[PDB]
């Protein structure tokens, strides 16, 4: 389920073309060659916060409800960037950026086989360097380590009583024995524990940049990021994300950027496109729309991970205090698509939408 907020300056502008904009130190965090586009140390640190809002119903054919309201709760994700350039061809950054997916079912809950609750954590520590082989061109290159923290339940929801219910519909429904046996499922408490799981556990990954300049007001960029081990112990995969995108600088007040990115976990598109309007020396506004298609299938669904074709509507500011200095803030809707799964002997319905609010702090040395 990763999207990754990594910056409140992206968020304002839907994260269009985050691999070609650089009026922050953010953006090497997601194309490492964009480390040759600043000519002194820049430093930016912030946080996003998720206000999402899931829900899912049915009745499972036990005939308890599957009803659950509010599943995923709100979230805090912290960012941190620094840039510097280190001589007229090179240059460094590092980033810290997280990506939190929660959901909580009550342990009582009829769909608990496949609900109960799921905590997973992510934490990318990003080192890398750049290096421009001349006006047009600059390539980078990234290492990353990912620090994963999982932590699933599963209890028999209705289970037993499902099983009970079957044994009663077949020709057993009528012995000493048979009756028992059913009434020894049924006997199953809904919050019994049938899954626990809960580790921490490294994994790491490169990932590269090419980047183009026409000229200093448009820039195009292909980035690379390298799928990820994390291999637990109580697997969680990062895929292989491919991205490309492009930013033009049309007028002194207004500037384009926009993206195309590719996951292969299953497949996955990304598509983003937004716009920057630079008023003046301290006011700089933006807007941005997103679409990201499901990776998983119609039927691989489930309703423990929230996720399904998204819509993104974006709007966001940022104050420059002087030229060092400079406040950014943006916000974010976004809904799903609302859709049925057909998990286990359930079938749900399920539909989300979130609203996201970030800040973030700018200095340049």
Do not use: C
């Amino acid at each position: 389920f990763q999207l990754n907020e990594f910056s409140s300056s992206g968020l304002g502008r839907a994260y269009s073309g985050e691999g070609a904009i650089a009026d922050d130190a953010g953006n090497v965090s997601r194309n490492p060659a964009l480390i040759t586009m600043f000519d002194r140390p820049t430093f930016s640190a912030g946080a996003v916060y998720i206000d999402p809002d899931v829900n899912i119903s049915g009745t499972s054919p036990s005939g308890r409800s599957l009803k659950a309201d509010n599943i995923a709760p709100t979230a805090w994700v912290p960012n941190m960037h620094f840039v510097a350039p280190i001589n007229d061809q090179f240059g460094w950054g590092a980033s810290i950026t997280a990506n939190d997916l929660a959901t909580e079912f009550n342990d009582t809950y009829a769909g608990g086989s496949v609900g109960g609750t799921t905590d997973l954590e992510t934490m990318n520590l990003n080192l890398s360097g750049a290096y421009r082989l001349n006006n047009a061109w600059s390539f980078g290159l990234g290492f990353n380590a990912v620090y994963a923290r999982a932590k699933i339940e599963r209890f028999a929801g209705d289970l037993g009583q499902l099983v009970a219910g079957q044994i009663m519909q077949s020709p057993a429904g009528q012995t000493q024995q048979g009756q028992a046996l059913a009434a020894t499922a049924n006997g199953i408490d809904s919050n019994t524990k049938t899954a626990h799981l809960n580790g921490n556990q490294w994994g790491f990954g490169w990932n590269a940049g090419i980047l183009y300049e026409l000229d200093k007001n448009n820039r195009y960029a292909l980035t690379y990021r390298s799928e990820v081990k994390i291999d637990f112990k109580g697997t969680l995969n990062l895929p292989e994300m491919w991205e490309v995108s492009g930013y033009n600088r049309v007028d002194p007040q207004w500037a384009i950027h926009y993206s195309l990115a590719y996951t292969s976990w299953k497949d996955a598109y990304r598509i983003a496109l937004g716009t920057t309007y630079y008023y003046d020396d301290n006011w700089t506004f933006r807007t941005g729309i997103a679409f990201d298609d499901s990776p998983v299938p119609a039927q691989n669904r489930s309703i423990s991970i929230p996720d399904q074709d998204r819509f993104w509507l974006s709007a966001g500011t940022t104050y420059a205090f002087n030229k060092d200095a400079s406040v950014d803030v943006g916000v974010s809707y976004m809904h799903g698509q609302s859709v049925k799964i057909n998990e286990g002997p359930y079938q749900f319905e399920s539909e989300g939408k979130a609203w996201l609010f970030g800040t973030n702090f700018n200095y340049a040395f």
